Design a protein around this ligand. Sequence first.
Ligand SMILES: O=C(O)C[C@@H]1CC[C@H](NC(=O)Cc2cccs2)B(O)O1
Length: 265
Amino acid sequence: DLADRFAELERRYDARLGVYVPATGTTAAIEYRADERFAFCSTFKAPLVAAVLHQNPLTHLDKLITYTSDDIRSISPVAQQHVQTGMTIGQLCDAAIRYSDGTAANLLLADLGGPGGGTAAFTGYLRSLGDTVSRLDAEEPELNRDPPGDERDTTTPHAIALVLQQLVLGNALPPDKRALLTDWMARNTTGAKRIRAGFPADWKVIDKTGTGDYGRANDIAVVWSPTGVPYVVAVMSDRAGGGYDAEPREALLAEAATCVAGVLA
Ligand SMILES: O=C(O)C[C@@H]1CC[C@H](NC(=O)Cc2cccs2)B(O)O1
């Protein structure tokens, strides 16, 4: 049973694995711990970009955001090199998705506005998509500090998969905006050893990764079959039994994805 093989992975990596592939017209759902909470980690940066796209005309992408060295409080591979010049909103969306840029994320949260530096607004966005489970309670990097059993800054594989489904493959965004989210995810630089590593070369993979404490490693993806048939793959993992500094394990996600591709191909 596919469920039994996921349990094999949990046992072998001493991990908790959560999987959701939504059903389609020609496939069953794949569900494993799909309604258990897992930390978002950097995965929220993809729907965050969708929020900003949703809320604004595309001309907003050209708005210049200036910030300081003092705004670099989290892993920010792009923003930390542009403190002198600032970055447009479009550049931040790019950085947030393609390089998990945590300062870009923080700036895009402030862009949504309102109490919580934008965290309330973000969660509200997910609520507008039908998601009553997910919650973002802090910015980077504090949103990573939540220990197991604290529901702050968590989602479920089921919730995040269905959010991604609506954003990339559904009608949550107008198709021009959707195209952007998709293109950015298609050119991600962080995802080569996760879901991408588990799918044959003839399948297309776009994704957004996340890594945190307690061995947290997530990847959410949209994949296209050699036929052009698209599916959403959400894979979430932690290794919390090893403590706050348990090693995150990309290969766990890669194996999970391989098992998923075996079912879908
Ligand atoms: O996209 C990825 O997979 C990596 C990305 C890096 C920035 C974010 N991590 C943090 O800010 C702190 C961290 C804890 C443990 C590792 S990095 B995010 O959650 O993950």
